[PDB]
Design a protein around this ligand. Structure first.
Ligand code: ATP
Ligand code: ATP
Ligand code: MG
Length: 293
C-alpha cells in the first residue's frame, strides 16, 4: 500500500537494435538487472534515474523516451520503478561490493541475461521505437497564486513561493534530458519557471508571444506552426507555457503522429517529454510537477 518510488534505465551505446545495452550484476541478490534506484528526498524520477545510472555503471547519460513502469511487492508495500532510455555519454565501470559486474550486450542477448520478466518487458519497449531521439520539453509554468476573478489573463503575475521552488527543482529534471535552448510564452510566470535553468545554462530565454493563452485562442494554427519551428531547430528545447495551450498542442501532435501517451495531466510545473526521430514524434511522456507524486 505504501509506495516506494524508484527509477531506472536502459543505458545504451552504439556498437535500430545495433546498439548495446548495460546489464548489471548485484552480489546481494545474485541478480542480473537494469540499473535503478530509489528517489532521494527532492528528486524526481528522471533525476534519480540519471544519478543511479552514474552511481551503478559509472556512466553519464542523457535520458530520452520513457519505457513504462514496473511494480512489485516489497515488505514496505509496493515498489514502483519508472524506466527511461538513456544514451551513454561516457564513463567507466568499476566493480564493487554493490555492483560487481557490468556487461554490454545486444538487445537479444540482454533479453536472455535479464532475469526479471518485467525488465524484459522494459527492453521490449525500448526496441519498439527509435532510441537516438531529440527531445522537446513542454513545461507548464509553476504555481503563481490565482488570477483575479475578472475574465482575462494577467501578464506580470509572478510565481509564488511554491512555484519558485518548483522552478529550482526543474533544473535537474530538465538537464537530465539534455535541455539546451530555452523558450517561454510572453508571461512573467512562464519566464520565471525556467529562469533557474537559464542561469544554470547561462542561456537567454526566447520570448514567445504566439504561445500565450490569448494567442492560442486567437490563432491556434500559428501556435502549432511555432511549436514545430522551435522543434525543428538544432538542440533540445524547453518551451514553458500555460494550461490552456499545452493540452491542445500535445493532443494535436500525438493524434497526427499516432503516439499514445502512457500518462496524462496538465499540472502547474509539469513537463511533457516529446521524443523525436527524424522529425517524427515517437514518444510523449507526461511528468508530474517536481513536488507532486
Ligand atoms: N523487476 C523485479 N521484479 C520482481 N522482483 C524484483 C525485481 N527487481 C528486484 N526484485 C526483488 O525484490 C527484492 C528487492 O530488490 P530491489 O532491487 O528492489 O532492492 P533494493 O536493494 O532496494 O534495490 P534498489 O536500490 O535498486 O532500489 C529482491 O529480492 C529482488 O530480487
Ligand atoms: N479570471 C479568469 N479568466 C479566465 N480564465 C480563468 C480566470 N481565472 C481562472 N481561470 C482559468 O483557471 C486556470 C488556472 O488559473 P490560475 O489563476 O489558477 O492559474 P494561472 O497561473 O493563470 O494558470 P495558467 O497560466 O496555466 O492559465 C486558467 O488556466 C484558466 O483556465
Ligand atoms: Mg539499485
Amino acid at each position: 500500500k505504501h509506495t516506494v518510488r524508484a527509477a531506472g534505465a536502459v543505458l545504451w551505446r552504439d556498437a535500430p537494435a545495433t546498439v548495446e545495452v548495460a546489464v548489471i550484476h548485484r552480489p546481494r541478490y545474485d541478480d542480473w538487472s537494469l540499473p535503478k534506484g530509489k528517489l532521494d528526498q527532492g528528486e524526481t524520477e528522471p533525476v534519480a534515474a540519471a544519478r543511479e545510472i552514474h552511481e551503478e555503471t559509472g556512466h553519464t547519460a542523457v535520458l530520452g523516451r520513457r519505457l513504462g513502469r514496473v511494480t512489485y511487492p516489497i515488505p514496505q508495500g509496493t515498489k514502483r520503478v519508472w524506466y527511461w532510455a538513456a544514451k551513454s555519454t561516457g564513463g567507466d565501470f568499476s566493480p564493487n561490493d554493490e555492483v560487481d559486474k557490468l556487461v554490454w550486450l545486444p538487445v537479444d542477448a540482454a533479453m536472455d541475461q535479464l532475469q526479471y520478466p518485467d525488465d524484459r518487458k522494459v527492453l521490449r519497449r525500448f526496441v519498439k521505437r527509435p532510441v537516438d531521439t531529440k527531445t522537446v520539453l513542454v513545461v507548464r509554468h509553476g504555481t503563481a497564486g490565482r488570477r483575479s476573478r475578472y475574465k482575462g489573463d494577467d501578464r506580470k503575475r509572478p510565481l509564488d513561493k511554491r512555484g519558485r521552488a518548483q522552478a529550482e527543482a526543474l533544473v535537474a529534471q530538465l538537464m537530465a534530458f539534455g535541455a539546451t535552448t530555452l523558450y517561454a510564452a510572453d508571461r512573467v510566470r512562464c519566464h520565471q519557471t525556467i529562469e533557474p535553468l537559464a542561469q544554470e545554462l547561462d542561456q537567454l530565454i526566447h520570448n514567445e508571444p504566439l504561445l500565450t493563452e490569448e494567442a492560442y485562442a486567437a490563432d491556434h494554427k500559428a501556435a502549432r506552426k511555432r511549436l514545430l519551428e522551435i522543434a525543428g531547430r538544432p538542440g533540445n528545447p524547453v518551451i514553458c507555457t500555460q494550461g490552456k495551450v499545452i493540452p491542445g498542442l500535445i493532443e494535436w501532435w500525438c493524434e497526427r503522429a499516432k503516439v499514445r501517451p502512457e500518462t496524462t495531466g496538465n499540472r502547474k510545473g509539469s513537463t511533457w517529454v516529446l521524443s523525436l526521430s527524424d522529425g517524427e514524434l515517437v514518444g510523449a511522456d507526461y511528468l508530474s510537477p517536481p513536488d507532486e507524486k
